[PDB]
Write an enzyme that holds these catalytic residues in place. Structure first.
Site, short mmCIF file in Angstrom:
data_model
loop_
_atom_site.label_atom_id
_atom_site.label_comp_id
_atom_site.label_asym_id
_atom_site.label_seq_id
_atom_site.Cartn_x
_atom_site.Cartn_y
_atom_site.Cartn_z
CB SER A 1 63.64 -36.59 84.34
OG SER A 1 62.54 -36.01 83.64
CE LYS B 1 63.66 -40.22 86.69
NZ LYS B 1 64.07 -40.27 85.26
CB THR B 2 67.29 -41.21 82.35
OG1 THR B 2 65.89 -41.44 82.52
CG2 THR B 2 68.00 -42.54 82.11
N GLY B 3 67.77 -38.27 82.75
CA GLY B 3 67.28 -36.92 82.61
C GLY B 3 67.64 -36.41 81.23
#
EC number: 3.5.2.6
Lengths: 239, 235
Positions: free
Chosen positions: B48, B180-182
Site C-alpha cells: 500500500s 503511508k503504511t504498507g
C-alpha cells in the site's frame, strides 16, 4: 441558522466579548450556529486572516513562486522572534509576518489588488490605504469569512487549484489520524480573529470568531481558547 | 551514506528485523542515515505504500477527479466496508478503490507511468503492487518521496499537493508528519517524512512480519522512536 445564546458561557469563561459562526458540514442541510448574530455580520479589518487570500494573490501574480522561496529579513528588530529572521511562506503564515506580505502588496499594486478582491467578493473589497488589510479600508464579517473559507475548501476560488491547495496546506495548525485543523489568526490592536475549519471523515466544520482585545496582547490566547472549547462541545475536536 | 549500526537497539526494542533510511534535510550537505545498508537497497513489493504514486496516476488519467469524488462500496464484507473518497482510501489502505483505478488506467498506461518515474523495477507484471513483480527499495522510496516533496514529479503540481495533503497523519503548530503504511503479508513498510521550519526529515522503513498483523504496530513504533532520538518528532 440557529442562535446559540448558551455559548455565552464560553465567552464569559474567558471574560471576552465577541462573536462566532460555526458551519458544520458533516451532515447535510444543517443550520449555521451563531453566537451574537448581529456582530457576526459586522465588518472588521481582517488583519492577518487576510494572509489566506493574499497568499493566493501573491502566487497568482508571481510575487512568490512556491513554498521554497526565501525572503530576506532586513535585520530590523520588530520585536517578534518569528519575524526577526528570513522567511518562507509557511513561516510567514504561521507567524503572521506582515513585512513579507507588504512586499507582495507592493509588487501586486493597488489596481490589481482591487481586481483580485472584487473577483473573490471579499468583504467590502476596498484596498484603499501599505498594509490595507491592517490599517486600511478593507473590512469583512465573520459570516463573510465563513463563505470565503468554504469556497477555498471546495477549490471554488478563481485561482489555480495548485495555489488553493498550497494555501490550505500552509494553514495547517494541528492534525490527528482522522482530523486536520486549518486556521489563521489575526490581530490589529483592538480586534482579534481566528478563522478556519477542522476536517473529519464525514465533513468539515468551519469557524470564524472575533473578539475585542481591551487587554491587547494578553487577550490573544482567548481566540483559540473559546473556539476550541466550542468545537470540543460539538465533538469537532478531540476531547 | 552513514551507517547507524547503533540503531539496532530500536529494532530489538520491538523484536523486529528490518531496515530504515533517514534523510535529514534540516542540515546542509549531509549523508543519509541507514540501518542495514544492504537491506536498504533490497527491493520489496511496495504494497500500500504504492498508493502515493498510484493516486498521482489516477488523478493524471482522470480515474478520480478530486478529493470530493465518492466511490461506492459494493457491499462485500472484506473484513473498507463503506463508500470512500481519496482520503479515506489512503488512510485505510482501501485496496478495492485502487483496483478500480488500476482497471481504468490499464496495464499499458500503468507501465508507462512507472517507467516515466522509474519507480523501483517499474514492472507491473502480474494488484501488481501487492502480488505482482513490482518492487522498490527503501533508498528508492526516499528518492521518490523527495521528488514529491519538491513538486518535481512529472505530474500536475496540484496533484502532487493533493497527495501530500492526503498523506497527513499528524501535525503540530510547526511540524507536519506525512506518511503511508504498507503490508504485503511477509513484510511491511512505513515511509514518509516530517516537515519542520528548518527542513524535512524523510524516512523509509521496512520490516519482516513473521507474526503477521500482530507485527504491524512495529512499523510506526520503530520509526517514531528513531525520529524522536534525532528530535524529528516531539518528545
Amino acid at each position: 441558522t440557529l442562535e446559540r445564546s448558551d455559548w455565552r458561557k464560553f465567552f464569559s469563561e474567558f471574560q471576552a466579548k465577541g462573536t462566532i459562526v460555526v458551519a458544520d458540514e458533516r451532515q447535510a442541510d444543517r443550520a449555521m450556529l451563531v453566537f451574537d448574530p448581529v456582530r457576526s455580520k459586522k465588518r472588521y479589518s481582517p488583519a492577518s486572516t487576510f494572509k489566506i487570500p493574499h497568499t493566493l494573490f501573491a502566487l497568482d501574480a508571481g510575487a512568490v513562486r512556491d513554498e521554497f522561496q526565501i525572503f530576506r529579513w532586513d535585520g530590523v528588530n520588530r520585536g517578534f522572534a518569528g519575524h526577526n529572521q528570513d522567511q518562507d511562506l509557511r513561516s510567514a503564515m504561521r507567524n503572521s509576518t506582515v513585512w513579507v506580505y507588504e512586499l507582495f502588496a507592493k509588487e501586486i499594486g493597488d489596481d490589481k489588488a482591487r481586481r483580485y478582491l472584487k473577483k473573490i467578493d471579499y468583504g467590502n473589497a476596498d484596498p484603499s490605504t501599505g498594509d490595507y488589510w491592517i490599517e486600511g479600508s478593507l473590512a469583512i464579517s465573520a459570516q463573510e469569512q465563513i463563505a470565503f473559507l468554504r469556497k477555498l475548501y471546495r477549490n471554488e476560488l478563481p485561482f489555480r487549484v495548485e495555489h488553493q491547495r498550497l494555501v490550505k496546506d500552509l494553514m495547517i495548525v494541528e492534525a490527528g489520524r482522522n482530523w486536520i485543523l486549518r486556521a489563521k489568526t489575526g490581530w490589529e490592536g483592538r480586534m482579534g480573529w481566528w478563522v478556519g475549519w477542522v476536517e473529519w471523515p464525514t465533513g468539515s466544520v468551519f469557524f470564524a470568531l472575533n473578539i475585542d482585545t481591551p487587554n491587547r496582547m494578553d487577550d490573544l490566547f482567548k481566540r483559540e481558547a473559546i473556539v476550541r472549547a466550542i468545537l470540543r462541545s460539538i465533538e469537532a475536536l478531540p476531547p
